[PDB]
Amino acid sequence: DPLRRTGRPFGGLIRDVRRRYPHYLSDFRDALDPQCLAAVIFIYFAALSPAITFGGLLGEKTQDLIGVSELIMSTALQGVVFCLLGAQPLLVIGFSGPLLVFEEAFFSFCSSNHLEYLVGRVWIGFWLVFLALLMVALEGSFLVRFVSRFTQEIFAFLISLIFIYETFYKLVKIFQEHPLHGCPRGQPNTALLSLVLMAGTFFIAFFLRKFKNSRFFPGRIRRVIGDFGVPIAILIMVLVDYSIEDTYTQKLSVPSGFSVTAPEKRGWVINPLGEKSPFPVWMMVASLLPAILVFILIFMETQITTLIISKKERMLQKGSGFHLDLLLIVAMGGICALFGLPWLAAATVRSVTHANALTVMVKEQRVTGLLVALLVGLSIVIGDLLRQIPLAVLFGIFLYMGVTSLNGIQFYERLHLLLMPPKHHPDVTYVKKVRTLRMHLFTALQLLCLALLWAVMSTAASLAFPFILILTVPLRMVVLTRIFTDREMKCLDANEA
Amino acid sequence: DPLRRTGRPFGGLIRDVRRRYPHYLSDFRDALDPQCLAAVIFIYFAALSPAITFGGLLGEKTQDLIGVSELIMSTALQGVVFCLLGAQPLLVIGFSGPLLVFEEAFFSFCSSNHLEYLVGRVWIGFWLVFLALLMVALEGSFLVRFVSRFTQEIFAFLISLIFIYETFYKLVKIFQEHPLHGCPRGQPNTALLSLVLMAGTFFIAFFLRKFKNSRFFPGRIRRVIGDFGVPIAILIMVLVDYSIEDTYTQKLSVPSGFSVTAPEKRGWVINPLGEKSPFPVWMMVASLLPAILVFILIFMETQITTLIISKKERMLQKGSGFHLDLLLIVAMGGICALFGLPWLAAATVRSVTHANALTVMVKEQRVTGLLVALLVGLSIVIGDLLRQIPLAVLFGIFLYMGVTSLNGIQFYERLHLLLMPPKHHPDVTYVKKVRTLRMHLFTALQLLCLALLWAVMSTAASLAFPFILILTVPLRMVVLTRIFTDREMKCLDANEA
Ligand SMILES: [Cl-]
Ligand SMILES: [Cl-]
Numbered sequence: 002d003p004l005r006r007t008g009r010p011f012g013g014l015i016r017d018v019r020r021r022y023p024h025y026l027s028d029f030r031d032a033l034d035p036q037c038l039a040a041v042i043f044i045y046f047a048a049l050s051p052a053i054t055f056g057g058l059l060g061e062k063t064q065d066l067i068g069v070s071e072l073i074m075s076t077a078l079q080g081v082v083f084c085l086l087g088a089q090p091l092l093v094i095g096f097s098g099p100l101l102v103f104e105e106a107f108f109s110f111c112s113s114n115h116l117e118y119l120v121g122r123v124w125i126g127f128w129l130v131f132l133a134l135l136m137v138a139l140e141g142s143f144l145v146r147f148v149s150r151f152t153q154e155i156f157a158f159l160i161s162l163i164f165i166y167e168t169f170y171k172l173v174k175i176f177q178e179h180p181l182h183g184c185p186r187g188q189p190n191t192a193l194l195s196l197v198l199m200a201g202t203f204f205i206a207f208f209l210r211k212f213k214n215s216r217f218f219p220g221r222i223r224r225v226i227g228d229f230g231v232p233i234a235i236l237i238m239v240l241v242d243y244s245i246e247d248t249y250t251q252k253l254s255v256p257s258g259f260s261v262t263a264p265e266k267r268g269w270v271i272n273p274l275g276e277k278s279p280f281p282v283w284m285m286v287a288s289l290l291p292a293i294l295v296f297i298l299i300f301m302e303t304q305i306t307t308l309i310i311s312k313k314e315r316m317l318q319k320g321s322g323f324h325l326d327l328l329l330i331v332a333m334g335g336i337c338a339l340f341g342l343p344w345l346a347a348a349t350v351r352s353v354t355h356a357n358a359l360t361v362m363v364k365e366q367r368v369t370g371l372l373v374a375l376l377v378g379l380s381i382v383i384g385d386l387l388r389q390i391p392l393a394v395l396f397g398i399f400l401y402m403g404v405t406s407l408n409g410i411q412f413y414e415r416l417h418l419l420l421m422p423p424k425h426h427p428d429v430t431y432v433k434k435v436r437t438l439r440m441h442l443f444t445a446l447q448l449l450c451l452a453l454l455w456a457v458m459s460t461a462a463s464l465a466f467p468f469i470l471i472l473t474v475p476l477r478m479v480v481l482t483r484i485f486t487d488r489e490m491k492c493l494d495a496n497e498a
Numbered sequence: 499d500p501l502r503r504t505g506r507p508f509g510g511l512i513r514d515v516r517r518r519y520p521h522y523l524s525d526f527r528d529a530l531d532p533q534c535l536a537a538v539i540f541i542y543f544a545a546l547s548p549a550i551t552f553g554g555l556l557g558e559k560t561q562d563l564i565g566v567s568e569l570i571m572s573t574a575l576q577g578v579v580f581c582l583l584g585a586q587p588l589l590v591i592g593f594s595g596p597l598l599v600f601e602e603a604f605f606s607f608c609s610s611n612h613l614e615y616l617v618g619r620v621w622i623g624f625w626l627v628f629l630a631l632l633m634v635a636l637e638g639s640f641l642v643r644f645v646s647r648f649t650q651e652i653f654a655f656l657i658s659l660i661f662i663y664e665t666f667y668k669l670v671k672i673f674q675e676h677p678l679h680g681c682p683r684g685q686p687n688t689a690l691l692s693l694v695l696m697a698g699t700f701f702i703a704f705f706l707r708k709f710k711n712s713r714f715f716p717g718r719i720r721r722v723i724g725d726f727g728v729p730i731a732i733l734i735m736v737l738v739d740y741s742i743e744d745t746y747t748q749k750l751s752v753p754s755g756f757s758v759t760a761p762e763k764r765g766w767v768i769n770p771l772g773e774k775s776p777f778p779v780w781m782m783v784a785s786l787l788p789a790i791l792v793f794i795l796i797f798m799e800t801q802i803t804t805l806i807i808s809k810k811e812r813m814l815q816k817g818s819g820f821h822l823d824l825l826l827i828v829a830m831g832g833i834c835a836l837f838g839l840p841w842l843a844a845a846t847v848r849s850v851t852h853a854n855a856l857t858v859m860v861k862e863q864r865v866t867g868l869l870v871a872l873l874v875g876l877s878i879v880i881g882d883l884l885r886q887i888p889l890a891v892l893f894g895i896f897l898y899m900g901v902t903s904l905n906g907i908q909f910y911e912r913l914h915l916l917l918m919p920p921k922h923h924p925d926v927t928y929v930k931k932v933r934t935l936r937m938h939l940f941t942a943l944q945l946l947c948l949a950l951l952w953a954v955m956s957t958a959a960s961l962a963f964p965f966i967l968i969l970t971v972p973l974r975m976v977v978l979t980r981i982f983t984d985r986e987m988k989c990l991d992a993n994e995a
Contacts, residue, residue, distance in 0.1 A: 181691070182744045184681035193690035194678070200697070216922040217914075247679045417714075425713040 003311075003323045004143045013140045017088045017322030024319050024365075028090070032366035040358035045373050046232040047354055048095055049380055051402070052076050053253060053387065054395045055096040058167065059343065060254075060262055062105045066118055067343055068262030069255045072096055073381050075342035079333050080374025087329050088322025090367040091310060091359070092303075093351035094330065094374075096343055098160040099298045099467075104343065106463035107291060119271045119341050120280045121288060126338030127273075128292030129299075133331035136300075142323040145304035150494045151477040153305055154412035155451050156470060157349075162455065164403025168396045172196060175251075175393075190248045195393040198238050198250065202397030203404075205234035210405065231398055238394045250391040258384055261341075271341045290464075295344065296331060297467040302346040303330055309349055310356045312497075319365055350406055411498070415444045431492045439485070443493050446481065500808075500820045501640045510637045514585045514819030521816050521862075525587070529863035537855035542870050543729040544851055545592055546877055548899070549573050550750060550884065551892045552593040555664065556840065557751075557759055559602045563615055564840055565759030566752045569593055570878050572839035576830050577871025584826050585819025587864040588807060588856070589800075590848035591827065591871075593840055595657040596795045596964075601840065603960035604788060616768045616838050617777045618785060623835030624770075625789030626796075630828035633797075639820040642801035647991045648974040650802055651909035652948050653967060654846075659952065661900025665893045669693060672748075672890075687745045692890040695735050695747065699894030700901075702731035707902065728895055735891045747888040755881055758838075768838045787961075792841065793828060794964040799843040800827055806846055807853045809994075816862055847903055908995070912941045928989045936982070940990050943978065 003013065003020075056069030076095055084090040107125070111118045136142065172195070179191035213227020226233070242250055256262050261269065267276070274280060304323060311321040326347065334344025355370065356363065380387065407413045411431070418426050419441055426432045431440060450473050458466045482490060500510065500517075553566030573592055581587040604622070608615045633639065669692070676688035710724020723730070739747055753759050758766065764773070771777060801820060808818040823844065831841025852867065853860065877884065904910045908928070915923050916938055923929045928937060947970050955963045979987060 181687050181742055183746070184686060189681060189686035190678050190690055193687055193694060196694065197690060216919065217917045219919060245678055249680070420714045422713065422716060 003320065004146060006140045006143050010138045011140075011324075013142055013322075013324030014137050014328060017320075017325035020320050021088045021322060021325075028319075028365065028367045031364055032368040034364060036359065036361070037364060037366055037369050040355065040364070041369050041372050041376075043228045043358050044093065044351065044355045044369075045376050046229075046235075047351055048076070048080075048093060048373055049377050050231055050235065050395065050398055051095055051348075051351070052377060053255070053380075053390075054399050055101055056255075057253060057392060057395065058101055059104065062101075063108045063118060064266075065263040066108075066266060067104070067341065069253065069387075070260060070262050070381055071342050073255075073377060075337055075345060077374050077378025078342070079330075079337065079345050080377065081371060082333060083326075083329055084367050084370040084374060088320075088325040089307060089310070089317075090370045091317075091352060091356050091363070091365065092306060092321075092326060092347040093355050093370065094345045095348045095351055097298075097302060097346055097348050098163045099156070099302070100295075100343065100346060102163055102458065102463070103295060103298060103467065106458075106466065110464060116284060117276055117278055117280060119267055120273060120276055121284060121291075122338045122341070123271050123273045124280075124285045124288040125292045125295060126335035126344065128289050128335075129296055129338070129344070130332045130335035132292055132296045133328050133335070136296075137324050137328040140324065142300075142304060142327055145300075145308060145323065147474055147478070148301060148305065149474070149477050150411065150496065151447065151481070152301075152470070152473045154410050155447060155454065155473055156301060156305075157406065157410050158412050158451055159454055159458075159470075161403045161406045162451075164399055164406070168199070168400040168403065171392070171396050172199060179249075185249055188249045191250060194242075194245070194248050194250055195391070198242055198391055198393035199397040199400065201241065202234045202238040202394045203401045205237055206230045206398060206401040207404070209233060210401075231401070234401075235390070235394055235398060238397065239390050242391045242394070243389065250393060252388050253390045253392060253395065255381060255384060255387045258382060267341055269340055271339060273339065294464060294467040297471055299331055299334065299344065299346045300327060301470075302348065303327055306347045306349040306352050310352055315356060315360075315363060317363055317365065350402070412444075412447055415440060416448075419444055430495065430498065434492045435489050439489055440493070443481075443485065443489070446484075450476070500817065501643060503637045503640050507635045508637075508821075510639055510819075510821030511634050511825060514817075514822035517817050518585045518819060518822075525816075525862065525864045528861055529865040531861060533856065533858070534861060534863055534866050537852065537861070538866050538869050538873075540725045540855050541590065541848065541852045541866075542873050543726075543732075544848055545573070545577075545590060545870055546874050547728055547732065547892065547895055548592055548845075548848070549874060550752070550877075550887075551896050552598055553752075554750060554889060554892065555598055556601065559598075560605045560615060561763075562760040563605075563763060564601070564838065566750065566884075567757060567759050567878055568839050570752075570874060572834055572842060574871050574875025575839070576827075576834065576842050577874065578868060579830060580823075580826055581864050581867040581871060585817075585822040586804060586807070586814075587867045588814075588849060588853050588860070588862065589803060589818075589823060589844040590852050590867065591842045592845045592848055594795075594799060594843055594845050595660045596653070596799070597792075597840065597843060599660055599955065599960070600792060600795060600964065603955075603963065607961060613781060614773055614775055614777060616764055617770060617773055618781060618788075619835045619838070620768050620770045621777075621782045621785040622789045622792060623832035623841065625786050625832075626793055626835070626841070627829045627832035629789055629793045630825050630832070633793075634821050634825040637821065639797075639801060639824055642797075642805060642820065644971055644975070645798060645802065646971070646974050647908065647993065648944065648978070649798075649967070649970045651907050652944060652951065652970055653798060653802075654903065654907050655909050655948055656951055656955075656967075658900045658903045659948075661896055661903070665696070665897040665900065668889070668893050669696060676746075682746055685746045688747060691739075691742070691745050691747055692888070695739055695888055695890035696894040696897065698738065699731045699735040699891045700898045702734055703727045703895060703898040704901070706730060707898075728898070731898075732887070732891055732895060735894065736887050739888045739891070740886065747890060749885050750887045750889060750892065752878060752881060752884045755879060764838055766837055768836060770836065791961060791964040794968055796828055796831065796841065796843045797824060798967075799845065800824055803844045803846040803849050807849055812853060812857075812860060814860055814862065847899070909941075909944055912937060913945075916941055927992065927995065931989045932986050936986055937990070940978075940982065940986070943981075947973070 003017065052073055053069050056072035059072060060068035080094050083094050107121065108118050111121050175195045176192045178186050179188045181192060209227055209230035213224060213230065215223065217223065261267060303326060307321050307323050307326055311317055330346060338344055359366065359369070423437050454466065454469055457469050477494065500514065549570055550566050553569035556569060557565035577591050580591050604618065605615050608618050672692045673689045675683050676685045678689060706724055706727035710721060710727065712720065714720065758764060800823060804818050804820050804823055808814055827843060835841055856863065920934050951963065951966055954966050974991065
């Protein structure tokens with residue numbers, strides 16, 4: 002197995018290279034199927050829409066220092082380089098929710114302590130490259146074994162709650178900037194039209210997702226339309242806002258062709274020594290802690306995704322790489338942070354959608370991910386026609402993604418059962434073989450950990466949010482094992498089900 | 499069976515009296531169960547909300563000649579008199595959709611031909627009383643046998659389409675009276691807030707209806723909350739509109755205590771000879787045709803409801819009356835039309851909800867319906883706190899009722915199957931035993947009849963909408979029997995399933 006640890010330095014990296022790179026020409030040869038174009042069209046929007054949404058979020062939170070342009074360029078460049086060199090090109094590299102939360106937290110830290118944001122990110126990137134080299138040299142990737150279900154499900158629930166909270170906080174911000182008063186700020190109809198666009202996009206996307214699973218059309222047409230749940234909802238609720246002539250709604254506001262979102266504030270190359278202000282020498286050495294906290298999120302997400310899409314059920318013949326992908330993502334993000342771009346991590350939802358796109362009932366082609374990255378990059382050449390998409394539509398898609406990512410989490414299912422009567426619980430292993438007062442005790446402990454994570458994230462110590470997260474790994478191995486029994490833990494924390 | 503025809507005049511009426519009135523004291527004795535109060539609370543809102551919605555619709559369409567006050571008083575008075583004298587007090591008497599459509603059509607007819615609305619209604623009522631006496635004397639109620647499923651389902655689909663069309667037409671009227679322009683008519687935020695209130699009420703009511711059938715709370719609490727799907731949605735979306743301070747939304751606008759909605763236009767007693775304008779002698783004799791068309795709707799709805807709630811599955815021990823209820827509703831409406839009140843008909847949805855409220859797994863009590871009618875009447879003593887309910891909330895409930903009344907119609911189910919692949923059709927009698935190209939032929943013929951009804955309703959000949967409706971009775975007995983076979987008709991037009 003790839004996670005086996007050998008004494009030789011860079012054992013995992015060398016094994017992954019010697020496992021995947023001999024199939025380099027076959028990776029391009031296998032892409033000639035007509036299904037690959039359908040997969041590209043399917044996942045291009047599922048990669049582009051999160052990119053622009055998180056670019057808008059970064060522009061709002063970090064005062065346009067990092068925005069839609071920087072995030073689009075980073076996603077495209079890192080996608081191209083990874084798909085050309087990564088061990089598992091079926092991984093879809095993109096900006097994630099927890100990364101956005103941490104970048105907002107780090108920006109708040111820099112603003113509070115009078116530190117420049119981008120230079121601090123440059124030094125976090127340098128330490129990230131050092132940590133990636135060290136971990137891959139010592140083959141620390143086997144630590145992904147210790148990330149149980151108890152931690153993965155808390156993390157995914159945290160991501161989805163982040164999405165929901167950000168959408169609703171943006172809605173409240175709109176309702177406070179444009180209050181409902183009779184006769185830009187104070188504009189009438191803007192708050193209600195933004196709410197209507199958000200709700201309409203969410204409902205169209207949700208109902209098309211349900212229609213994908215429904216039985217109302219030919220089986221091919223149902224799936225084809227359902228895979229376009231997000232593009233069709235965005236198109237419809239953008240045409241609706243285009244038809245309205247006089248009302249003001251906030252638009253996406255991408256910058257001109259190949260430009261920085263804030264040309265006055267920053268250039269492309271961030272000065273690591275200091276940008277118009279001498280960066281202190283204590284922070285360039287103290288950025289080890291934020292680098293560790295970022296590396297925790299990147300490692301957890303990328304390695305969990307690699308575990309998810311490397312299952313024998315997926316039938317991946319060539320085999321993914323746990324070490325090569327981790328190095329090629331963390332080092333790439335560390336180098337990108339020198340140019341003021343956001344570091345990324347292989348996102349599980351996009352990668353799973355891409356993998357399911359190539360399943361034949363797996364194509365294993367680099368060119369699909371490569372072309373998706375290139376199209377995401379050319380979406381800034383598009384320029385206009387992206388600054389006509391209202392932010393309300395993108396936040397509706399944001400809420401739709403946040404709600405639908407909860408589906409399939411065993412934590413969420415056991416949260417449902419906290420309300421249902423004991424007779425109505427479904428016939429699953431953690432219900433049949435665990436007493437209900439014990440299943441609910443486990444759910445309550447997981448809720449306590451999630452609430453502690455959310456409280457740490459909301460307070461002034463938001464930087465320590467990744468570390469507290471991995472504190473759920475020793476807990477499950479030290480505390481929860483001494484509270485619960487082995488029979489209960491083998492059913493509640495089942496590695497697979 | 500009650501529908502058996504005997505030679506003696508008023509045979510059905512006499513049989514129904516001799517069947518039900520000996521249980522007169524037992525009807526009051528059986529009401530002492532604590533479940534009766536819960537039933538009253540359940541159905542009081544399901545009777546009041548349609549009353550106020552249709553009063554607002556009548557005020558809009560007929561220029562406030564008949565409104566919320568007249569409809570509330572008519573519903574209360576007719577409910578009290580029926581529950582005191584009717585053979586089946588479990589029938590809930592209330593204004594229905596088709597009656598509203600016909601009153602709008604008759605008002606348009608009167609306006610086009612320079613005729614007074616209320617005097618024309620007085621003469622329609624007199625002819626209605628004559629027709630009720632004649633039919634009950636000759637025992638024509640057995641004609642309800644000939645109203646097949648083919649006609650009942652077309653009628654119910656027409657009612658639901660009427661509800662949906664009226665809600666969306668009111669929404670478009672709001673968006674045209676208060677257009678979305680930057681800086682009562684022309685008010686900002688009114689169109690969008692009305693849309694938001696309508697959608698919110700519809701979604702809250704729909705999701706509480708689903709929660710009634712869900713499994714997320716104790717089985718008693720689930721049903722108790724779900725039975726309050728409409729009151730809770732109305733309360734929440736009225737408090738939401740109350741919180742908003744500056745935006746203008748159209749309110750229900752009931753008049754003062756025990757007053758006419760238009761005191762200047764009309765008094766309580768409508769002059770049958772002519773009200774400030776000599777009513778011509780040709781119309782007082784020509785109102786036979788509108789009386790026939792109204793009697794068709796009243797007869798169809800009341801007798802179909804009596805059939806529905808008199809099934810042996812319902813376990814009605816005392817037994818309903820087909821003739822006594824028809825006479826006591828048509829004659830009562832004819833007399834009420836003399837006082838400018840809208841005639842009513844026993845509505846199937848409210849009556850079925852009332853009957854299910856008293857089922858023990860049937861109480862058969864007059865006092866529940868009597869108290870519901872009295873509370874509906876006192877709702878005009880409430881006065882204020884009803885003119886704070888925005889019309890958007892009531893139209894959201896209107897759309898919710900229109901959508902949920904489609905459920906259970908075999909016509910609607912066979913409209914679903916017109917899209918699904920033949921493999922996914924459910925295992926039901928009209929699917930297994932009928933070839934799919936024949937089931938869809940039947941559905942297409944029913945759609946053609948429904949479209950002809952809708953086109954006749956929309957054009958200038960809207961008065962002939964009831965007559966065309968009963969033309970579907972000979973058709974199914976003359977045309978559809980010569981197209982389809984007996985094996986197919988016995989499964990598609992199944993009298994029960
Ligand atoms: Cl994600
Ligand atoms: Cl109704």
